[PDB]
Amino acid sequence: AMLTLLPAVDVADGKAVRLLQGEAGSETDYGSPIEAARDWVEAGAEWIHLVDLDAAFGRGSNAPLLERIVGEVGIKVELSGGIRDDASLTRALKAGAARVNLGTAALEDPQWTARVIAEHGEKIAVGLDVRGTTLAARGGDLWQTLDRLNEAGCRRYVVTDVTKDGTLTGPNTELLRQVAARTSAPVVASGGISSLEDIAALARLVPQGVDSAIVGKALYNGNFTLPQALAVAGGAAVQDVQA
């Protein structure tokens, strides 16, 4: 199957925002999150990657708003931010999320994380937020953590190069290849996409196990439309898709 795009909707203070290099305080406001989500559905998305940034930073929450989005869209939603314990996981699943992402919990509560993975299977992914080879917590050695999560049976990873996130500098394809080689679980690419050629380059990683990509800033910045990105992810030529 082609590279799956997950257009992002990140929520802070009730707004759809993008951060630069994952830094709290660096938000650019792009308006209503439910409007953004509706736009992605109307563009032909199969998935949305929906993040509660306030919860991710351990500094408040937008949970009802995210629940409304998950319930209203008829497509699959990957939900992230603040999923750290049974109450929050239960809530995310009850909301109708197709997948959740664990982040800080995978580092701080390895026992709980392994239990969750064993119980919920393909509904669970782990987000690995990488700076060099060190994990960041919105956190340990990347490779040791990855081996532990593989042993626990993790079914999917979301790999973000935090240094590239929001920067429009291109994805860290080397890191993606390195992580994909280290696991039999599929990898979702995140951070740095800037161009239709970046999407084409990621689409050539699907055979290595990078089967998906989250797209944030490039869409909100108007670099390309979501239909353009989907076209390239599904094999259209960049030179044709370019406006």
Author numbering: 0 to 137, 143 to 247
Provide the authors' original text about this structure.
The PriA enzyme is capable of operating in the L-histidine biosynthesis pathway as HisA, while also functioning in the L-tryptophan biosynthesis pathway as TrpF. The product of the priA gene, which is a hisA homolog, catalyzes two analogous isomerizations of structurally similar substrates: (i) the conversion of N-(5'-phosphoribosyl)-anthranilate (PRA) into 1-(O-carboxyphenylamino)-1'-deoxyribulose-5'-phosphate (CdRP) (TrpF or PRA isomerase activity); and (ii) the conversion of N-[(5-phosphoribosyl) formimino]-5-aminoimidazole-4-carboxamide ribonucleotide (ProFAR) into N-[(5-phosphoribulosyl)formimino]-5-aminoimidazole-4-carboxamide ribonucleotide (PRFAR) (HisA or ProFAR isomerase activity). Moreover, evolution of PriA in response to genome dynamics has lead to the appearance of the SubHisA and PriB subfamilies, which have been shown to have different substrate specificities. After the loss of constrictions imposed by the retention of biosynthetic pathways, we found that evolutionary patterns correlate with the sub-functionalization, yet not necessarily specialization, of PriA into two new subfamilies, which we named SubHisA2 and SubTrpF.
To potentially identify mutations in active-site residues that may affect kcat and KM parameters, we attempted to elucidate the structure of the five PriA homologs that we were able to in vitro characterize. First, enzymes from Org15, Org21, and Org22 (H1) showed dual-substrate specificity but also poor catalytic efficiencies, namely, kcat/KMProFAR from 0.01 to 0.1 μM−1s−1 and kcat/KMPRA around 0.01 μM−1s−1. In the case of the H1 enzymes, the poor turnovers are compensated for by relatively high substrate affinities (KM), mainly for ProFAR. Since the loop contributing Trp139 and Arg137 is mostly disordered, and Arg137 itself does not adopt substrate binding-relevant position in the structure from A. urogenitalis, only the equivalent elements from the M. tuberculosis homolog are shown. Indeed, the indole group of Trp139 in PriAs can form a hydrogen bond with Asp128, stabilizing the knot-like conformation observed during ProFAR binding. An extra factor potentially hampering sequence and structural analysis is the higher-than-normal mutation rates of these protein sub-families, which translates into lack of sequence conservation and disordered regions in X-ray crystal structures.
